[PDB]
Design a protein around this ligand. Structure first.
Ligand SMILES: CC(C)(C)CC(=O)N[C@@H](C(=O)NO)c1ccc(-c2cc(F)c(F)c(F)c2)cc1
Ligand SMILES: CC(C)(C)CC(=O)N[C@@H](C(=O)NO)c1ccc(-c2cc(F)c(F)c(F)c2)cc1
Ligand SMILES: CC(C)(C)CC(=O)N[C@@H](C(=O)NO)c1ccc(-c2cc(F)c(F)c(F)c2)cc1
Ligand SMILES: [Zn+2]
Ligand SMILES: [Zn+2]
Ligand SMILES: [Zn+2]
Ligand SMILES: [Zn+2]
Ligand SMILES: [Zn+2]
Ligand SMILES: [Zn+2]
Lengths: 519, 516, 514
């Protein structure tokens, strides 16, 4: 734990973190739908669809253990409503014990298998029913088909979207902020789905924890304060930790990493968390996250129209995702595995002490790098991070980074891109993507472009000057720093930020965790 | 107090000229009914011709000289016309057989000169003063002007006549000589006499503001500017207080302190106070934006036409307030208590600078999400407006070079005024009429308030296009229950044609204080 | 009706126009709230606030004549919800007679005085429920404070936002009944049919604007004007290129030169049956598409894809023409004018630097082809003052600077006559179409001095474009009271991706209460 430097005494010296969220107070009960649905206090929502019939009528199929509610929800009354994806309706009636109840439904389209995006729409429609309504209990009746992974995804998404981050609110807190205390779920073959509930709660927070870190502004979330939070997290989870300061980094000759942070008031802090299983270890994995707490661009300042310099607190999303994974792994405690969580945290700033364009710097593997652009600082920090990671002697090195903005032009805001030197590892990422429902796509490392990184003076150029394929060029650059290890690179620069909702996604936490677990 | 330097050659004070050549001018006002004596220097007639556009010049005044009167007869003067801005020089011998200079400046055919027309008239008259080493100027008024317009003539004459040579060195004007005497002829002269010394007060306050603004950022930094304000206060016997960083920290001014975090100069909060002897009926707080230099911060002014080299003008609001302070302290109005405020700092790029995206806390507890570092003015004004309201005043009037959007709305002549109180706005509009400083009332549109709703903080700093209106909506959030008005002078502060400050707002704020 | 030229046989030859809308089929009843409410049919929505507590709990005061709904509306239930402006909830249930009804609310904030901006948010919340409604009846219970004008605004807005334009397409059902419970109902009833007239006047203008440039061209726009005039029994006249050349409208014609569509000048006339006491000319800018000419809109943010909207001034005048010809005010004679053309890049286009001559003889030096609206208005104004009217009011999407000045909500008004400007402002207040008075600063006039022509079209330096354009237009009105309304910023609703029909009601209130 290191002291955070301040310019004025009003400068924050730590990131506020909410561990005990209202979600953790919610008691979750899972009932088998065969036994019928009890409709009591709170709000009972049925998830219905109508296969084939686009915007077809609503039909409740479950047994409802109440004569009154059954009559209300009979087919001929429900037919005036439809199952259009995103549609919702509220019902009000009295049950058999003469107690008023609130019932409703959410349309789930006319397609049998809902994609992760469709399910997210259903959750969002469901969440609006939770907002501005002081409910004590929510009951969800699944009348659609979901496998165990999609059921978990439903819960995680619900917990995430329902949650509101009011850490930075002061005079403008929602005076009506009131969370439900009970969640009931009716589903076919409930005994098989029950194991997903706690996994969802663990996945939710790991995602929401990374979200809190990302959403934290660059004056709260700096290299020192972020490394402090990693320490606290590790102390709560009994993870081994090591926080490397500038001096050790100099001794390890991390010249590429150090140059990036030269222009910052905050000293570089290299984060090293370690989870090791108690049993015999059969797999060693290093998970690397890019940790630029603020990216001004350096002397290559982000001043072009649309450079979104104000959003650049998000450039440690990779680090956040890695730390969120550290929570999920340290909590669920997988066996036969050893995971290193790495992040070379620093801050790309403009100063008299900054690194300059044209500077030639030496990485910790001896390779000299000519800087052609100070705004491509991520691949520099990752270079030293990758070399460090390989010295640990692992089987897999996976890095996750908000690296290139060109991802928005290639995959957009929904799908992340994965690059690598090992096809087996890449397939495991794609498999992890399926089971976590965090969309990833395999993109090529095109060797024909490697020649454009040939520097006249240094061993290698940082950027190309004749190739607009930035995501591939950067992957080619990073590949030059992994000598003999299966390695994959996930570019989340396009998917890390939910633009419509103006908030982080916490993308990668579940993806990386499903990777650790299913191995 | 002590100005920090990078090298020894860095200046540690703003050069300021108090005793200007204008203050060495003896001003005499005579009644035109007794006629004009024409003996020495240059004598200029302000003549018009109501109706006839570009009509003939006719000297109506009685001239107490046979030879000069003969020269100025209609027969001789018919060849000249009264087109606004026209000037002619005449050369002749008077009765004493002394050569003498006589001329005129045409004042159009409209019987009511406006603020713009009178400025053209003065400018022409000033051109007759430049490059002509004269010891005396007499001006004969053959037009109809009210007391406030006659005063505006003098203030403007004095302002345009004076040349700022504080930073001249090997290029000082070798031929620059100022007149030592000024004569004025006008109808009902006893009425206009009091306006003379009021004009000299109004002029210097405007020129004092002009000097501070023109002073470059390496000369005019927050420390040197707060030093100057103290020097001003000590001269005028005003109560003064300069709040430094650690005091500001205690007052929790996080917004204002964040803006200045990057600068090598400590933040300095200027607090001057004039208090009349006797019963105070009105308590007023005047707030001036005091950014000694606006680089833009990490949102650097690097766009084409961002005019970063002119950014020394972002202290103009503060200058206007200090200029007003001189006027008020000199004229000493009664039954009022005036607080002169300016949260002075510099907006720089550094490892210590505030960033786009920072969530800062204002002194009233509201958390603000910083969308753009170049919108730093409203951040400093936020803490200043809270401090001001804490003084229990009746009126808060802030003046600021806030938004460049003003150039597209009102332009370079008219300032914009916003507010939460219609009575206060009208008073500003009234003072605009009497100070002859053009000001237009622009609305604070409440529908736009939603665009400032922040996801994480209490409020957004910027809306991420009606910048001026949005900036006012922001400032409204820091005035709880006081009549408040906001004057945006970003477009009218600088005279691009003359390449110099206007000192805009000094006379406006003084007229507001005096006539209240 | 002139023939609309085509490049291919697939190019349309008229603007699709819906006159009979489902809104005209809605039967409206206004009851007094002091008598209580009947909630036995369809959707009932309470407009409630909480002046005492910001985002405070919902409490329904009205007594309803149904036991089931009375239980639903008890304070224990409603306090689970809050009145945050725009927030809404609605529930389906059975009433006492076992009929299906729906009951809900819309939060109206904690301020007793509702602005038109606030009311618009309330209506939008209401409409969102209507777009998911299949019920036959909507009942709106006003448990808040509205005067006669804001209530009419509520109806016009409700109608306008409810109606959806589907002329170019290749869920819900429109209600047949609207019930309203409000205090002093008898005083409000007169505002209903006025709201229906104002609605279609606005929606008609909306239809013209939204109609794309391949549909809405000078020939088809003027054709629709003729058809509107015939339906309302207005005197009309469409001046063609030959008549325009005779009248020497060289500024107007220079803009259209590069277009495949011949310039058309629209002149509609309403005249009262009795004695004519006031004469008015309403002038609308009618650029059916603004490419920018050789000063092409290629800069980032120039938004060339939206420039079908630059005839919004023309549409608003035609929209007003509908209301006037329908409401038939006495003692007035109104002229509806628009010099309609298209600003295109061609070998025939006018060029930057061209010196053109207006119908009043003034030579103009063109500095920017993208500033073509003021050129066409210049000749239109000269035409307007020749009619011998008391008031000339032009309305135009003139300068993008309005977005930086007043924004997207308030229009700017400029003029030479303070009395006319006040009437505009008063019309703005009664119609709830917000306008703000901006100055015509004479000091800027010198920037329009041309070296070779009588006057410059634009300024080289001055960025106060809205003011500079006003000074320009001022040179084409010799001695008639004249006002200019710049709606370049308020014409298009960007959040809803559709026109606002801005100006119709403002202009109609102007002619009706003058
Ligand atoms: C290859 C380079 C440095 C010339 C351009 C680039 O890819 N820049 C990166 C960057 O600065 N990484 O440290 C970059 C990454 C994300 C974004 C980005 C911009 C947005 F406006 C946005 F919404 C987003 F999600 C990402 C922009 C640039
Ligand atoms: C709202 C924002 C920050 C996007 C653009 C803005 O209004 N900037 C202000 C500013 O920096 N306030 O601290 C601003 C104010 C005046 C001017 C300005 C520019 C000129 F070229 C000019 F001549 C002038 F007089 C003022 C430019 C920007
Ligand atoms: C004076 C000039 C031509 C340099 C810039 C200008 O004011 N152009 C006008 C125009 O082309 N009139 O025919 C103009 C008017 C509205 C808009 C405009 C732009 C928007 F992005 C927008 F959303 C809007 F509503 C209007 C842009 C330019
Ligand atoms: Zn970067
Ligand atoms: Zn980066
Ligand atoms: Zn700025
Ligand atoms: Zn500023
Ligand atoms: Zn145009
Ligand atoms: Zn146009």
């Amino acid at each position: 734990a290191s002291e955070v430097p301040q310019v004025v005494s009003l400068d924050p010296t730590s990131i506020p973190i909410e561990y005990n969220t209202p979600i953790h107070d919610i008691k979750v009960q899972v009932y088998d739908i065969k036994g019928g649905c009890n409709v009591e206090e709170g709000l009972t929502i049925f998830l219905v669809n109508n296969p084939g019939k686009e915007n077809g009528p609503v039909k409740i199929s479950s047994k409802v253990n109440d004569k009154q509610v059954s009559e209300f929800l009979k087919d001929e009354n429900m037919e005036k409503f439809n199952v259009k994806l995103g549609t919702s309706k509220h019902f009000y009636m009295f049950n058999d014990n003469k107690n008023s109840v609130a019932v409703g439904y959410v349309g789930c389209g006319s397609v049998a298998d809902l994609s992760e995006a469709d399910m997210k729409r259903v959750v969002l429609s469901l969440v609006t029913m939770l907002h501005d309504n002081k409910l004590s209990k929510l009951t969800v009746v699944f009348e659609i088909n979901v496998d165990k992974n999609l059921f978990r995804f439903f819960l995680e998404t619900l917990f995430y979207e329902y949650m509101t981050d009011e850490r930075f609110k002061s005079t403008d807190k929602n005076v009506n902020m009131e969370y439900i205390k009970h969640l009931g779920v009716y589903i076919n073959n409930a005994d098989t789905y029950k194991e997903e509930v706690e996994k969802a709660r663990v996945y939710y927070f790991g995602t929401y924890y990374a979200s809190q870190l990302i959403a934290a502004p660059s004056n709260y979330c700096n290299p020192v304060s972020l490394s402090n939070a990693a320490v606290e997290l590790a102390q709560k989870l009994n993870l081994e930790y090591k926080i490397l300061g500038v001096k050790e980094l100099e001794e390890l000759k991390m010249g590429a990493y150090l140059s990036v942070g030269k222009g910052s008031m905050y000293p570089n802090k290299f984060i090293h968390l370690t989870y090791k299983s108690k049993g015999d270890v059969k797999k060693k994995i290093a998970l690397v996250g890019k940790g630029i707490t603020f990216d001004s661009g350096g002397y290559n300042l982000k001043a072009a129209p649309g450079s979104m310099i104000d959003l650049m607190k998000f450039d440690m999303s990779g680090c956040a995702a890695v730390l969120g994974c550290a929570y999920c792994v340290g909590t669920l405690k997988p066996e036969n595995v050893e995971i290193h969580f790495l992040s070379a945290v620093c801050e790309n700033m403009v100063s008299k002490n900054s690194y300059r364009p044209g500077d030639i710097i030496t990485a910790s593997n001896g390779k000299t790098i000519e800087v052609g652009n100070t705004d491509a600082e991520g691949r520099l920090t990752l270079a030293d991070a990758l070399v460090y990671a390989e010295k640990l002697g692992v089987d897999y090195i996976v890095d996750i980074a908000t690296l290139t903005g060109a991802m928005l032009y290639s995959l957009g805001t929904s799908y992340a891109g994965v690059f690598g030197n090992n096809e087996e590892l890449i397939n495991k990422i794609l498999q992890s993507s399926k089971t976590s429902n965090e969309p990833v796509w395999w993109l090529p490392i095109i060797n024909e472009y490697r020649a454009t990184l040939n520097s006249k003076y240094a061993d290698i150029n940082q950027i190309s000057s004749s190739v607009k394929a930035s995501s591939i060029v950067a992957s080619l650059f990073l590949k030059e720093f992994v000598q003999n290890t299966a390695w994959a690179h996930i570019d989340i620069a396009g998917v890390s930020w939910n633009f419509k909702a103006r908030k982080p996604k916490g993308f990668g936490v579940r993806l990386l965790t499903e990777f650790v677990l299913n191995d």
